[PDB]
Amino acid sequence: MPVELRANWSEEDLETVIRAVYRQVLGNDYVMASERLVSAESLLRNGKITVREFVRAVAKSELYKEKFLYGNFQTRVIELNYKHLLGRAPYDESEVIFHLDLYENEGFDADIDSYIDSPEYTNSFGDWVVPYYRGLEHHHHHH
Template identity: 35%
Template sequence: MNHLNTITVSRRSSFEERQAALHQIYRQVLERQPYCYERKCLAAIEKDFLNDKIGVRRFLKELGHSNIYLNVFYFNASNLKFIEWCFKHFMGRAPLHQTEVQTSCDLLMKKGATALITAILDSEEYRKVFGCFTVPYPRQLQRYESPKAYWESHVLNHEYVGQRGHVVPTIYWHELGLNCDAGVCRHPEADEILDPPVSEAGEQLQEELLEMLRSMDVNQARKVVASLSPQQKAALRRAISA
């Protein structure tokens, strides 16, 4: 594992050390520091954390369950993208394989967003890696199930929220033929051939495709992406890039 940027607090940690840990938590989970009005909503749990009444894991659970986190990462995102973000923020990696994605998707659809976050924070892997007092950080595993799993974690941990949209997670980029390395998802031929103007019917198709991916579970979405015609994939690529 990569333990660079590891921050751990304990009963002996000073107020200043806890402030530094709090700053790092927001950087990892929100990918920014809270706005002024958000700090007011978080004031109670911030105070408990800084006064050593709760540890890192408890603070993470409260933050993840808050509307501040859910408004940014859940309510305006597809289920699959939200799952990907949860693993990034709380586990420091991307989902390892489709089984993990499917299990998370089932939990999310049956019990909701807060249940998924709780399951991650209560998992054996989380306890072994971070315990109750270490702030999660982007991890590099010693072993990956495939080169694709390594690539997905590497790219995900180095992107900013919204940089590649709120719908399609990294696990589908290659299936859509997208190149997202520069921060904007584009088809490799986009710079050589300009896309024709999108008609009203084409815009409706884009919206239907995006809405379809938002509402499906992981197996259904994979089948849909694989079965799209070149024209449909092109429409979806334009919608993602917009």
């Protein structure tokens, strides 16, 4: 079931949204891992910023150099972001290579912003929708 923020929302629905995007760490009740976007929370809860922009805030909220970077592979990290922020995995090596080049040009911060302003992904996959696992079923043309 896709998580979406509708214009006619109840707080319980939004509570579901924010908890889906926020990084619920292995600590049950420690109010996240020092992850506090008080401005993003209030702006989103007022329906002023989009889920896209909220994704930005959460993705780079705390020091992103946690495990998936030096204790992982850049290719794998990109796939993680791709599947977590766009809800889908890359189609070819080219997407990964593009993001690798971007990571070298500006870094991980800019990598994140790429998943936001992406025009076709926003309109088609979800603008006020929270990235869910969108399994792309391999097909034989249309026959």
